[PDB]
Curated annotation (Swiss-Prot), chain A:
Parent-record interval covered: 1 to 63 of 149
Modified residues (Phosphoserine): 50
Function: Component of the ribosome, a large ribonucleoprotein complex responsible for the synthesis of proteins in the cell. The small ribosomal subunit (SSU) binds messenger RNAs (mRNAs) and translates the encoded message by selecting cognate aminoacyl-transfer RNA (tRNA) molecules. The large subunit (LSU) contains the ribosomal catalytic site termed the peptidyl transferase center (PTC), which catalyzes the formation of peptide bonds, thereby polymerizing the amino acids delivered by tRNAs into a polypeptide chain.
Entry's family note: Belongs to the eukaryotic ribosomal protein eL24 family.
Compartments in which it is found: Cytoplasm
Note: There are 2 genes for eL24 in S.pombe.
Protein name, per record: Large ribosomal subunit protein eL24B
Assembly, per entry: Component of the large ribosomal subunit (LSU). Mature yeast ribosomes consist of a small (40S) and a large (60S) subunit. The 40S small subunit contains 1 molecule of ribosomal RNA (18S rRNA) and at least 33 different proteins. The large 60S subunit contains 3 rRNA molecules (25S, 5.8S and 5S rRNA) and at least 46 different proteins.
From Swiss-Prot, chain B:
SMART domains named in the record: Ribosomal_L14 (SM01374)
Extra facts: There are 2 genes for uL14 in S.pombe.
GO BP terms in the entry: cytoplasmic translation
GO molecular function: large ribosomal subunit rRNA binding; structural constituent of ribosome
Protein name as it appears in the record: Large ribosomal subunit protein uL14B
Keywords for this protein: Cytoplasm, Nucleus, Ribonucleoprotein, Ribosomal protein
Cellular location(s): Cytoplasm; Nucleus
Gene giving rise to this polypeptide: rpl2302
Protein species of origin: Schizosaccharomyces pombe (strain 972 / ATCC 24843) (Fission yeast)
Curated annotation (Swiss-Prot), chain C:
Subunit structure: Component of the large ribosomal subunit (LSU). Mature yeast ribosomes consist of a small (40S) and a large (60S) subunit. The 40S small subunit contains 1 molecule of ribosomal RNA (18S rRNA) and at least 33 different proteins. The large 60S subunit contains 3 rRNA molecules (25S, 5.8S and 5S rRNA) and at least 46 different proteins. uL3 forms together with ES39L one of the contact sites for the signal recognition particle that targets ribosomes to the endoplasmic reticulum membrane.
Taxonomic superkingdom: Eukaryota
Gene: rpl301
Signal peptide segment: none
GO molecular function, one term: RNA binding
Family matches, as SUPFAM superfamilies: Translation proteins
Described purpose of this protein according to its UniProt entry: Component of the ribosome, a large ribonucleoprotein complex responsible for the synthesis of proteins in the cell. The small ribosomal subunit (SSU) binds messenger RNAs (mRNAs) and translates the encoded message by selecting cognate aminoacyl-transfer RNA (tRNA) molecules. The large subunit (LSU) contains the ribosomal catalytic site termed the peptidyl transferase center (PTC), which catalyzes the formation of peptide bonds, thereby polymerizing the amino acids delivered by tRNAs into a polypeptide chain.
Gene Ontology biological process terms in this record: cytoplasmic translation; translation
Residue ranges the record marks as coiled coil: none
Protein name, UniProt field: Large ribosomal subunit protein uL3A
Family the UniProt entry places it in: Belongs to the universal ribosomal protein uL3 family.
Organism, as annotated: Schizosaccharomyces pombe (strain 972 / ATCC 24843) (Fission yeast)
Region annotated Disordered, chain positions: 1-30
RNA sequence: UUCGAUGGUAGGAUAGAGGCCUACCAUGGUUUUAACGGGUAACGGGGAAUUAGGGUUCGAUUCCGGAGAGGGAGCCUGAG
RNA sequence: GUCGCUACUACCGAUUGAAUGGCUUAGUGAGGCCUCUGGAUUGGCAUUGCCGAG
RNA sequence: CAGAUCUUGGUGGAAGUAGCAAAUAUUCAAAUGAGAACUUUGAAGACUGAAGUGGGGAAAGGUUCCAUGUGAACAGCAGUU
RNA sequence: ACAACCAACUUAGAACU
RNA sequence: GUAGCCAAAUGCCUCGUCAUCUAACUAGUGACGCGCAUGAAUGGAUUAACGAGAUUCCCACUGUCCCUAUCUACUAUCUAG
RNA sequence: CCAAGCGUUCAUAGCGACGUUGCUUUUUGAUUCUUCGAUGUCGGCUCUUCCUAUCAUACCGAAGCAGAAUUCGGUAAGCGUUGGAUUGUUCACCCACUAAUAGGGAACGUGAGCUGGGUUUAGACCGUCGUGAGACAGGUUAGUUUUACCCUACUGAUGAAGUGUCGUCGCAAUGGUAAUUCAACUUAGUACGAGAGGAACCGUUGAUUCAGAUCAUUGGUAUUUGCGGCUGCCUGACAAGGCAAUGCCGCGGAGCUAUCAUCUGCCGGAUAACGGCUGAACGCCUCUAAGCCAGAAUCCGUGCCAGAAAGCGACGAUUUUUUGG
RNA sequence: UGUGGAACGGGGUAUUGUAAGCAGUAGAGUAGCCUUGUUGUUACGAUCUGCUGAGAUUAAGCCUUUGUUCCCAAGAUUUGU
């Protein structure tokens, strides 16, 4: 019983949420929803979008 | 095929006439799915296979001695997402398979790329010759 | 040639609209006189569906002692009030009701079932019967004794407390629930003692019990043969449409057979689904309704934002694995199983490890408002 | 001569000259005295066999120089 | 000189010819190296900013 | 005359049924009038978008042109047009 | 041999985003 | 019977024989010809380009299909005429 | 039916000529009884039902150590009988899967269901024949597939009341019905067997086909025109908007939907083949002569769907001081 | 006339992705004037940064509400053991 972290949006992923994508280089990515998965497929960076936790951490949002 | 037991039902993403990459080092690259073992009788339904199945395939690209013949093969990866008993939907970046014999032993020696856990648990030879498992 | 199986089953015929909505018990469990006096059915309302993560206890399985995620259906089951008793004789023409005895006072909820315009009416439903109960106390006993000596089959009349549910309907659902104890005299005495009394869901069903859910499926209106019976779509070249059946019949017999797929009603039908396992009988008076032994969050059985088109469950509820017929907020009938369950899957105890309480109104990712506040920190509407 | 082929200026790199590399400026350099490409069952030489003379053939191999340590590529140590 | 039978030699040839090795085109890219960062840890300075490093 | 897929005329069931769905689109207020979804005025929203749903001609038509009145018939709904 | 403006459309290149 | 052509739009036997192609082809192509009944201006062979001509195959592509599902407008539906 | 026999030897374990008795013919034939004031023509697709002359599944009977295979042998049509290359073709031959890929009828089932690949005779080419117009055991190419709005049938949807009226809760006469098959594993290296070999009652875990539902998750769908972005033009500019018969793109809740997702899918009786019991006659003997047991995916039932709209039961109040009961 | 309904508003829940406006020399650079500049004065400049997890939508088949404003105690037809 463990809650994972989305690879793109960085949000908590409970069991039965999102999907799992295994790339050709043996790297496993967890997407919390289709929006994050589609954006990753579209090659969007999670550090660019303002709603991602990675962006907030890199831009000191919250202090 | 009396290898390690039973496999849970999973979504079929590789019907007949599907071209998939060859993950072993036998010299093939274009495994062309011809038929699937264990397919029942149903009108108009194309026999389709998922990871861990025992499809029949021919080689379209690769070493000439591997072409113009039918050989057993095992699907190790598929692009179509399937869910497990834990409620996790997973899929791979490509559809891949390895040439085997009717007993299930791999014709090659090494497997390139990740392998499905269902296929690895079903076939001990593939699990032995594989590296990263999901 | 090219033989293929039939499209659909000729057992759920006619494919017409159901003549009812509550859903009726077509066969009560066989009565065992040795067992204690108990009810064989209950009524609830479907609130929605959610997740369940549990550890499997099936020896010999690949998923033994492993995590499995299963869909469950939540049915809100507030206590039902018993207001009457019906006795059934055993004539060679079937079961025949002999007489019905009602309680002294019937609530507004059950009394509204007898009216189509409640407010416009004078509400004089059980007036002379109430007067008879108050000032005679002899005819009620006479009828109860008649049910005691005759009427080998005894059923009580119970109505739901729909006012405790977040439903706009004020008309309660009234249903005959069979009593399958023994000593028909004791059955009548039990009914008399339970007159105007509330029977709870935990007194009728228990944990890990296999039951049957009875209800009317979702209405879908008319539908073509392609979706009504699963027939093959005709080719794109087909003139005058393709979502049909090509050959409806042959020559002599010069009639359309009853076994041929035809367009028509494809929903709102009475169905009984067998072998539904009770995963949790939760009470509405505790704050740990949705908590488990492995997840101690103080949360109740309701997604944040409420159940979609239902509301908040504030009463006792029953969680059933899988799906049940009917849309949300429809009244469902829970019936005790007529079979015997000796399989390991049926007898396996179920210990829930985590219950999903995330919003079903979208791609919810938080289980509690406290967790949402912790993740989001403080917002613009929170700083000022 | 593209992605340096010929030359000038300036710079970088090298222990050091140098298109070794970079930016710009000119279209230059070789060749029927065979350039270039291809083959070589070609490591090169001192040398060996035959011996009128002239020549022909061989030379992996005891001496000298070059290359390699299964095929490439990169790097530390160390004057090397 | 044509026609012969045979062992064997060579040529062309549909099969959009196959099978190795150098020379290049396009794509991707292990590895070590140079450089920009990062300061668990060592920390002299209840204290608290400064010399510092792999 | 009961017939001739008879002749002429009238009239039925089908039947208040098939149907009156191409060409993007109408809305508000006022006037008139017995009667306004179709008339007129104003406002709004739109289309044709110069090889036009614009302005003229040849052939053909013959008064359809204009004004004033009418709403019996036609304008397959309506009408004060 | 210089040169104060008016009146013109192209083509090529660079940086940034 | 040529300086030719063919199981050809011309071959009944015939799904002719050999090879290629495919996992599998009575299809297609390349060769053979005692060719029932090919053949030289009743024109024969080859042929670049061209063809809304016929035919075989490959890549890309896709609801043709596995296996159907969802959406929009106009009908069908009901109403006034 | 017959038996000379083959069948190392044993006449019908398996074959069994010559004759003879029959059934069917979906093969073409024979005839011309219906139709020429007109019954649309093959194949394929789709869909339902029926038959057994049984491929598989269920249960029985035989030979040889088992184990397998054969007799499909005996009942049995309940339930299944596939994906492709070729041919318009049916037939037919191959590539595979599968337990198996059985054979037929229904106006050689099925064109106001589709398609038009065959036929398709109007245009055109070739081969043969004819002087010619033209002809064909022939080959090839292009060639309009109309109408239901009537009755009935079928699928669904309303619906009047003489038995009071209006409602609530019920019974079930009758009609329909549903589940199917496979794999692996502890029996175990067990029984059996000189050795080698290798089961099975049963249970467990899964899976195929089918059926009924459902939308917690995942996928799809976009008129949520919800949010954001983009091009051309227009409202003087920003902003905010409009048009481009839904302008385009990304995401997109809700709903719908997916063997693209999830859940669920029993046991009682009577039997067929066949095996037994007491037991005679025919003093022996034998399941049968009377009767009683066991016995199949068979049949009828439990269960599930509908509910006689002219089958029925129980219960509630019986137009309020106008008037009616 | 009621633990009433409706229309709004609030909160929650969801979708999208950081609204307009202001400010900042952050911005590749460009152009004029003089005390002549290790934050130059002046002006323009795709874009970027901070207010801003912002703004917008949120039932139309989401939940909730103690908030505000209205509405209902009506009308017509039929019904007798």
């Amino acid at each position: 019983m463990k809650v994972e972290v989305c690879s793109f949006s960085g949000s908590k992923v409970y069991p039965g949420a999102g999907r799992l994508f295994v790339r050709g280089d043996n790297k496993v990515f967890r997407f919390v929803n289709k929006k994050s998965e589609s954006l990753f497929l579209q090659r969007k960076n999670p550090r660019r979008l303002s709603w991602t936790v990675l962006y907030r951490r890199m831009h000191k949002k919250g202090i | 095929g009396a290898a390690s037991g039973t496999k849970y039902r999973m979504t079929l993403g590789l019907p007949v006439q599907a071209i998939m990459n060859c993950a072993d080092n036998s010299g093939a690259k274009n495994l062309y799915i011809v038929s699937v073992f264990g397919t029942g009788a149903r009108l108009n339904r194309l026999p389709a296979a998922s990871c861990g199945d025992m499809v029949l395939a021919t080689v379209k690209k690769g070493k000439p001695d591997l072409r113009k013949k039918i050989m057993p093969a095992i699907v190790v990866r598929q692009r179509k997402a399937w869910r497990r008993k834990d409620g996790v939907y997973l899929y791979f970046e490509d559809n891949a398979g390895v040439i085997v014999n009717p007993k299930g032993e791999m014709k090659g020696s090494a497997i390139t790329g990740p392998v499905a856990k269902e296929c690895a648990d079903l076939w001990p030879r593939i699990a032995s010759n594989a590296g990263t498992v999901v | 040639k090219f033989e293929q199986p039939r499209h659909g089953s000729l057992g759920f015929l006619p494919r017409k609209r159901a003549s009812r909505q509550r859903g009726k018990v077509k066969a009560f469990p066989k009565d065992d006189a040795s067992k204690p006096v108990h009810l064989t059915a209950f009524l609830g309302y479907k609130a929605g569906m959610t997740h369940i993560v549990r550890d499997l206890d099936r020896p010999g399985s690949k998923m033994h002692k492993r995590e499995i995620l299963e869909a469950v259906t939540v049915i809100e089951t507030p206590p039902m009030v018993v207001v009457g008793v019906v006795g059934y004789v055993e004539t060679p023409r079937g079961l025949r009701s002999l007489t019905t005895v009602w309680a002294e006072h019937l609530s507004e909820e059950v009394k509204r079932r007898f009216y189509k315009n409640w407010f416009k009416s004078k509400k004089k439903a059980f007036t002379k019967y109430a007067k008879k109960y108050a000032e005679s106390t002899q005819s009620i006993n006479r009828e109860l004794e008649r049910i005691k000596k005759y009427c080998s089959v005894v059923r009580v009349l119970a109505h739901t407390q729909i006012r405790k549910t977040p439903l706009a309907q004020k008309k309660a659902h009234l249903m005959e629930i069979q009593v399958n104890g023994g000593s028909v005299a004791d059955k009548v005495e039990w009914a008399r003692e339970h007159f105007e009394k509330t029977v709870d869901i935990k007194s009728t069903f228990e944990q890990n019990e296999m039951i049957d859910v009875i209800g009317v499926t979702r209405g879908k209106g008319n539908e073509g043969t392609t979706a009504r019976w699963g027939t093959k779509r005709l080719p794109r070249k087909t003139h005058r449409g393709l979502r049909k059946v090509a050959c409806i019949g042959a020559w002599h017999p010069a009639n359309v057979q009853w076994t041929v797929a035809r367009a028509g009603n494809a929903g709102y039908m009475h169905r009984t689904q067998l072998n539904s396992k009770i995963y949790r009988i939760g009470a509405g008076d505790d704050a740990k309704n949705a908590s488990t032994d492995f997840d101690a969050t103080e949360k109740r059985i309701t997604p944040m934002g409420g159940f979609v088109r239902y509301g908040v469950v504030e009463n006792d509820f029953v969680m059933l694995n899988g799906a049940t017929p009917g849309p949300v907020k429809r009244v469902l009938t829970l019936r005790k199983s007529l079979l015997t369950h000796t399989s390991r899957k049926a007898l396996e105890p179920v210990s829930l490890k985590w219950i999903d309480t995330a919003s079903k109104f979208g791609h919810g990712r938080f289980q509690t408002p406290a967790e949402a506040k912790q993740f989001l920190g403080t917002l613009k509407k929170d700083v000022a």
